[PDB]
Design a protein around this ligand. Sequence first.
Ligand code: NPO
Length: 338
Amino acid sequence: ESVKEFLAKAKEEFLKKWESPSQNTAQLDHFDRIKTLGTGSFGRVMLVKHKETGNHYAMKILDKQKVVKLKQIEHTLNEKRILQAVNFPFLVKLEFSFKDNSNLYMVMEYVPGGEMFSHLRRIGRFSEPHARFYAAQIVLTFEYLHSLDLIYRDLKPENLLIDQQGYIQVTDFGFAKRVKGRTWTLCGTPEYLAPEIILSKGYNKAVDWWALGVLIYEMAAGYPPFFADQPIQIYEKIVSGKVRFPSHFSSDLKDLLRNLLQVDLTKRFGNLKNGVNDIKNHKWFATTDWIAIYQRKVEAPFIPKFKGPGDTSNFDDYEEEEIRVSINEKCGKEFTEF
Ligand SMILES: O=[N+]([O-])c1ccc(O)cc1
């Protein structure tokens, strides 16, 4: 009952913000630009500093014209509407959002420890206890999101930041969506796609549990289970129902992964009658104190090295390009709700 009541309150609070989203809560000239932290085909993420408070933030900047071109309008509206409505210890906090003639802006807490991807590639692989510490946080986060009828759809190490306590902050809600029943959009990242996405089915939250299997495998092995030079070859492996496990994997790890990387979505852990509890009660998680993880009382396997809240050392170097704002409004109608 404690979990039922927690999730009922969580959904109540989400729905209130979902139905009445915040809008236009800052503007660009309230911030100083510090550094480009990452780039994409329709936007970038910048470290900025608020000029009055001195607080640092990560600012995601999306070019409205490129969003339309890349057919991401609904996705960008989902992303902001969801992020402004959620509240969970392992989800990045959106502090402000606004738009101007050219761009959409989402201003989030800055996490100087950087992406799990960098740390994983530096160390090679994580031990099972280390992978399990992160996996537990994802399990709780998906239990939260799924209860709110949200599917995340982009789990991968690049979207998981490691904070000053060594805990995960899930960022990048660009593919997240509120879904009752099924959804159909082809999206995600190739190595992490469930078979039913590849096969163009109407799919559900089970795709997030598949992706958790991929992430746990990658954390514990150092590489993902389905790898190839071309996406088409990745997709053939994903749909095949065959995965090879390193000999160093524990038997409990292999068993959990066979049930998450289950090609038949109707047999996949997280999507059965017992829902998330088939995962939480699995032997691989026997040492996990779920409440202690939620309360952030477990000492983390490691804390990233950083010098302070403005340190960018754990992010990489990108060409610094202008943030141009047109004299004329672009795509006003498409982004009215933002
Ligand atoms: O906002 N975002 O989508 C982000 C932010 C930071 C990061 O490292 C990756 C993605």
